[PDB]
Amino acid sequence: FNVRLLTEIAFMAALAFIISLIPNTVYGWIIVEIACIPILLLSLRRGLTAGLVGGLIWGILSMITGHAYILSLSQAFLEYLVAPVSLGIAGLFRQKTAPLKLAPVLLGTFVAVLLKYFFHFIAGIIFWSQYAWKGWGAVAYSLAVNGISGILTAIAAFVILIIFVKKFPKLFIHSNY
């Protein structure tokens, strides 16, 4: 049903935003983005389009609540529309049939967090270089900050989605009935 789908999309976007309110800073803009997780789960369970749309709504929530860090129109577009929308790419690893296998869950999480932090890394180069550490070029700087955020976000998403695969595998498989 379309009703069920819209609500799940809506709820997971809201959940992501709500989770984004937890302090998640390790050092500067090195962060653990646990708020990616409801979007990943949404995409993994409902597929690409649902995932893309959940990401969109999450990004729009960040911006209109003042919880987004904005430097320009293009940068906000890149980092709060494209980047969260890109998480939906996880939907390409949706499993429709039991038994749930772990490897597609990890593979789709890895690819989507990577795709997300790839866009932040491009952002870092164009929009954030003024903050590059003493002696660091912009590309190197952005790689470390966003390469490390990506890895820690993926670590976090794995821990949680692994627990879910083992204790609640059906979260990942949509049933009409």
Ligand SMILES: CCCCCCCCCO[C@@H]1O[C@H](CO)[C@@H](O)[C@H](O)[C@H]1O
């Ligand atoms: C697709 C829906 C997304 C639109 C939501 C954008 C949220 C508004 C944030 O913009 C803000 O505008 C203010 C006025 O110029 C500036 O004071 C501030 O610096 C800038 O951050």
Ligand SMILES: CCCCCCCCCO[C@@H]1O[C@H](CO)[C@@H](O)[C@H](O)[C@H]1O
């Ligand atoms: C595609 C996402 C929609 C984004 C809408 C919010 C745009 C917020 C604009 O912020 C402002 O941008 C100016 C240049 O763009 C800067 O000069 C200014 O310092 C900065 O505060």
Ligand SMILES: CCCCCCCCCO[C@@H]1O[C@H](CO)[C@@H](O)[C@H](O)[C@H]1O
């Ligand atoms: C997924 C990535 C996570 C690890 C972060 C890697 C840090 C990037 C370092 O880059 C290199 O540092 C050299 C230091 O000598 C510079 O000279 C060189 O120009 C630059 O390219």
Ligand SMILES: Cc1ncc(Cc2csc(C=O)c2C)c(N)n1
């Ligand atoms: C060096 C660097 N610093 C800050 C950001 C901005 C950023 C990093 S993760 C994330 C998720 O909301 C945002 C807005 C960046 N891209 N690169």
